[PDB]
Every structure is written in structure tokens, then in C-alpha cells.
Amino acid sequence: SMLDDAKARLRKYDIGGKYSHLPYNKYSVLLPLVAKEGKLHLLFTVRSEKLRRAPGEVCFPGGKRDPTDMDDAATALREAQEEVGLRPHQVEVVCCLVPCLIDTDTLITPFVGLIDHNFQAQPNPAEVKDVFLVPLAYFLHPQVHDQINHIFEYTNPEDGVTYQIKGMTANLAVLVAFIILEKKPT
Ligand SMILES: Cc1ccc(CNC[C@H](C)O)s1
């Protein structure tokens, strides 16, 4: 099936806990995969203006590890619940992708999760201004604008609203699309 095929592809790129003990400032993100109308989509947030990190930017749900978290996957799930109301029984964490090194002292660990079909986002307005889906296939033929810095523009055909996706967020979206969608019969 579509969902079983995605999980089998994803598992081949799982690095697991290999880099998780290194002595960095630690953050985790959840890359949430949602199936709608027979296709896979990724879920994104727009951060609220009043945050420290990335005010007003398009990002995946996530945040800083705290002492309560059993592991890096726990960080991602805790933060996703706080930001958009995703509960743990509504997510299957499938793998841990290559981590992102930034600022010389920080490591960001990305996890891919499959999201239950009955989940409906409840945006927490203290953290998130908006929550939206993009079809995964978009990232194979994106609409690119150069600011050189490459920026993707996505317009939701439901409402005509345009979103700008860039940086590590855009890079991770492309990676997930390549993993799941490359070399597929039609
Ligand atoms: C927890 C976070 C660390 C940095 C962030 C900014 N958005 C980038 C993310 C890869 O979508 S959020």
C-alpha cells in the first residue's frame, strides 16, 4: 500500500541513535506525513511573531530538548502536542533522518512521523499563527524564487494563500520527497 511503501523506504535512511549522545544544545523536529485524497502531504506551521527562534517563519513542529524527555523523539512529540494538538497515540515515528549542525554548538534531529487520518490541527495561538499542508510531490517541481538564496512559493488551491518555504525546512522537505517518491511505477 501507499503508507506501507513510504515506511519501508524511510527505514532505509534511519540513522537511529548514532549521533544522539554528543554534547550539543539539542533540538528535535517532527516531519508529519498526512495522507489526503490518495496522496501524501507534509504538515507545516507558521511561527508566531513573539517567539525567540524564527518569528513568523514556516517551520516543522519542534523545539528544545528538556529534562523530562526520555529521548530526542520524545522532544519532537512533546513539542508537536503543545504547538498543534497532536497527541502521541496519533503519530507513528518511523525514523530519524540525518541531523542538521548549526551555529557551531547546536544539533537538530529530524524525525518522520505518520499521522492518524482522524487528526485535526488545533493551532496554539501563543506559538503558531497558522498550520497548513503541502503535497509531498510539490517538492519535486517547486516554484522557485531567488532572493543567491532559493525560496519556494506554494499557493493552496483551496484558498489562494501563498506561503514561502526556505532554509533547513525546504531542504528537509526535498529530502523526504526524494526518499519516498523516487523511482516509482505510475
Ligand atoms: C525546533 C527548531 C529549530 C529551528 C527551527 C526553525 N525552523 C526549522 C525547522 C527545521 O523546520 S524550529
User: By the 8 A CB rule, do 53 and 42 touch?
Assistant: no
How many angstroms separate the first and last alpha carbons of the chain?
A: 14
R_g of the chain, CA atoms, integer Å: 16
If one counts every other C-beta atom within 10 angstroms of the C-beta of residue 136, the result is 21
For a ligand 1 pocket test, name from 29, 47, 64, 98 the mutation site with the most ligand atoms within 8 angstroms of its C-beta: 29
DSSP SS3 for 71: coil
How many angstroms separate the Cα of 124 from the Cα of each of 62, 95, 115? 13, 26, 18
Residue type at 58 in one-letter notation: V
Q: Residue 62 burial by CB count (10 A; 0-12/13-18/19+): exposed, middle or buried? A: buried
d(CA 110, CA 96): 6
Q: How many Cα neighbours within 13 Å face the side chain of 148?
A: 4
Grid coordinates representing 113 are 512521523
Q: Whose CA is nearest to atom 10 of ligand 1?
A: 169
Helices (H), 13-166: 72-84
Helices (H), the chain: 2-11, 72-84, 167-181
Nearest-atom number in ligand 1 for the CA of 64 is 1
Between the CA of 9 and the centroid of ligand 1 the distance, in Å, is: 24
Between the CA of 184 and the centroid of ligand 1 the distance, in Å, is: 30
Using a 6 Å CB cutoff, which residues line ligand 1? 27, 29, 53-54, 59-60, 62-63, 108, 168-169, 172
Residue ranges at the known binding site for Mg(2+): 79, 83
User: By the 8 A CB rule, do 152 and 170 touch?
Assistant: yes
d(CA 41, CA 132): 10
DSSP class per residue in 119-134? ------TTTEEEEEEE
Domains of the chain by residue range = 1-186
Q: Whose CA is nearest to atom 1 of ligand 1?
A: 63
For a ligand 1 pocket test, name from 168, 171, 174, 176 the mutation site with the most ligand atoms within 8 angstroms of its C-beta: 168
Cα angle 111, 116, 119; round to 5? 105
d(CA 30, CA 186): 29
DSSP SS3 for 132: strand
Q: How was this structure determined?
A: X-ray
The experimental resolution of this structure, in angstroms, equals 1.9
Q: Which of 183, 72, 93, 138 is nearest to 64 (CA)?
A: 72
DSSP SS3 for 101: strand
